């Protein structure tokens, strides 16, 4: 319903109407299966491959573990990102990174996501292209965002370590301007 969505999400009514018209225009009532999601991303990322990261966050948006994403699944996830607090965005990010949803990220779990994002740049990168370089990026991340020093980052580990920074905090306010 339009009213229950008016109250569940931080959106106004006209912003809900615009989003619903667009959503249903792109996939009418065959709401989305995990394959059409990736085909929808494929329009925004030429020169690269986006299917793996698309699959990675399709399960983040799928709150229940059904095979499909509805409109409330879509719009609740958009509201928790575009209208929520910085802590809510960070919780969403961490829950995306943590694969098995246990509460801790190991080097394999985030290595997979780093490979996924790197695949999106595509065939040719203007500087060199390596694999131990994504390993180095994972290493720099675990350097910047861990006090456990056990090669494992946790929910509070990521929350309190990701807040102290400056440039990423100026970044994570990008999602408030244009909506």
């Amino acid at each position: 319903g339009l009213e229950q969505l008016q109250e569940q999400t931080k959106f106004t009514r006209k912003e809900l109407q615009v989003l619903y018209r667009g959503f249903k225009n792109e996939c009418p009532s065959g709401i989305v299966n995990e394959e059409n999601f990736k085909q929808i991303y494929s329009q925004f990322f030429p020169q690269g491959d986006s299917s793996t990261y698309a699959t990675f966050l399709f399960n983040a948006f799928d709150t229940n573990h059904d095979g499909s994403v509805s409109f409330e699944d879509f719009v609740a996830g958009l509201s928790v990102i575009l209208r929520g607090t910085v802590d809510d965005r960070l919780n969403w990010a961490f829950n995306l990174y943590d694969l098995n949803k246990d509460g801790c990220i190991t080097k394999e779990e985030m290595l997979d996501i780093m490979k996924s994002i790197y695949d999106m740049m595509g065939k040719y990168t203007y500087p060199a292209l390596r694999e131990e370089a994504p390993r180095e990026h994972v290493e720099s991340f675990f350097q910047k965002m861990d006090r456990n020093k056990d090669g494992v980052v946790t929910i509070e580990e990521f929350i309190e370590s990701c807040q102290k920074d400056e440039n990423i905090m100026r970044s994570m306010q990008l999602f408030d301007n244009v909506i």
Binding site: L2, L16, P28, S29, F45, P46, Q47, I117, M121, T125
Partner: protein, 448 residues
């Protein structure tokens, strides 16, 4: 659906109240009720109008639900749908009457797309116009539908891959021909040989033909083994028909020389030589028409079954009648009802060799009826067979042509995406939408 006779049912419930000697009648279910009003559906500028009680008849669809409140404008009091206004009329008329029609002039894909948008299912199309919906949808569907082993499997199942495949195909389509010509010629009785018996060429120059057919069968068996080694599913291949054809074309020579005249009776090798002609079916790989012939013989086997049945029925009937009408005569060749099958099959096919002709009035009358009866019972499967043949041929034509244009539109789409990427690279070297997309890509450029 039925909601305007509900006052009538309530009024009819008067018959129960005096016989409702049961103490309490239930208190009425009166609630807040507001009148019907005309609601205005503004579909692509075209204004439709209807009572809302008409739309609340099917509450499992877009218009009967509260989903349509996503399309309402409080400032204009109208629902606006940015959809096609010519198919929405069929949806509205489904809500009014109760049956969903199909406009014969409408593209089936647009119709299906609109039905999917509004929540209607194509299963509830009225019987008045539902066969033609299925017709058009069937037609639309059918219109829109390793370096050593798999490379040679791609060469085999497509002889036009490389000129090496073309040469291999044109050389395997040569030993078939030479073996066929050899098996034909080996029976030609030639050479007077005024010193000895008159013999056919095949047994006079015995080894000269042994060389030829041995070469041919070795090539056949080696290319068959190569087909086997390139077969991905080596059990689906064995079950195929061409595999059976090749097996039964090569084995009449193996079975032949294993049991050679070391043990021979003349009544058993003519069968091994007759089977040697079935290798002429190996041309199935070379001519598409010979494959379409098999496809159409298999597509209409229900007609050939009835052909055989009605034919043998008419043969038995007319052979009985002709035998009993022609039994007693001077030198009658109608000695038996089986012996009268010959005549009948020579007469039903309008062949008429003339070695058996009736000589009595009844025989002549019934032969004259047998000829026409055969004509009409053989004229039944021929239109079906030729129609199926032409249909399958023109089907394959359009299939290949559509598979051609599919590559053209794929070329179109990746050309467009290349153009978009070049537009991004151009904007990086310094239209109200691409700004945000390019900014998203630039934010991604963090990766390095």
């Amino acid at each position: 659906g039925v909601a305007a006779w509900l006052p009538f049912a309530r009024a009819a419930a008067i018959g129960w109240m005096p016989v409702a000697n049961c103490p309490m009648p239930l208190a009425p279910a009166d609630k807040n009720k507001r009148q019907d009003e005309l609601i205005v559906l503004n579909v692509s500028g075209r204004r439709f109008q209807t009572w809302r009680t008409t739309l609340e008849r099917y509450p499992d669809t877009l218009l009967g639900s509260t989903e349509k409140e996503f399309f309402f404008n409080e400032d204009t009091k109208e629902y606006f749908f940015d959809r096609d206004p010519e198919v929405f009329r069929c949806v509205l008329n489904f809500y009014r009457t109760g049956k969903l029609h199909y406009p014969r002039y409408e593209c089936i894909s647009a119709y299906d797309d609109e039905l999917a948008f509004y929540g209607i299912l194509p299963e509830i199309i009225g019987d008045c116009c539902y066969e033609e919906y299925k017709d058009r949808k069937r037609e639309n569907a059918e219109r829109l539908m390793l370096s050593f082993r798999q490379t040679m499997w791609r060469a085999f199942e497509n002889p036009h891959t490389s000129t090496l495949a073309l040469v291999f195909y044109y050389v395997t389509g040569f030993f078939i021909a030479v073996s066929v010509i050899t098996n034909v010629v080996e029976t030609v009785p030639c050479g007077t040989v005024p010193g000895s018996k008159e013999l056919p060429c095949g047994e006079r120059y015995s080894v000269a033909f042994f060389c030829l057919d041995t070469a041919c069968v070795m090539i056949f068996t080696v290319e068959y083994l190569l087909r086997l080694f390139a077969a991905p599913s080596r059990y689906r291949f064995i079950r195929s028909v061409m595999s059976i054809i090749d097996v039964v074309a090569i084995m009449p020579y193996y079975i032949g020389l294993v049991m050679t005249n070391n043990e021979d009776v003349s009544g058993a090798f003519v069968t091994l030589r007759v089977f040697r002609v079935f290798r002429i079916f190996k041309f199935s790989r070379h001519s598409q028409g010979l494959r379409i012939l098999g496809y159409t013989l298999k597509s209409c086997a229900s007609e050939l079954g009835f052909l055989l049945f009605s034919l043998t029925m008419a043969i038995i009937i007319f052979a009985t009648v002709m035998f009993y009408a022609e039994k007693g005569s001077s030198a009658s060749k109608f000695t038996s009802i089986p012996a009268s099958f010959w005549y009948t099959i020579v007469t039903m096919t309008t062949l008429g060799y003339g070695d058996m002709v009736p000589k009595t009035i009844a025989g002549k009358i019934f032969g004259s009826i047998c000829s026409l009866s055969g004509v009409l019972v053989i004229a039944l499967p021929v239109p079906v067979i030729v129609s199926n043949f032409s249909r399958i041929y023109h089907q394959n034509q359009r299939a290949d042509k559509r598979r051609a244009q599919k590559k053209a539109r794929l070329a179109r789409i990746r050309v467009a995406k290349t153009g978009s990427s070049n537009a991004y690279l151009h904007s990086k070297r310094n239209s109200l939408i691409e700004s945000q997309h390019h900014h998203l890509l630039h934010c991604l450029e963090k990766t390095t």
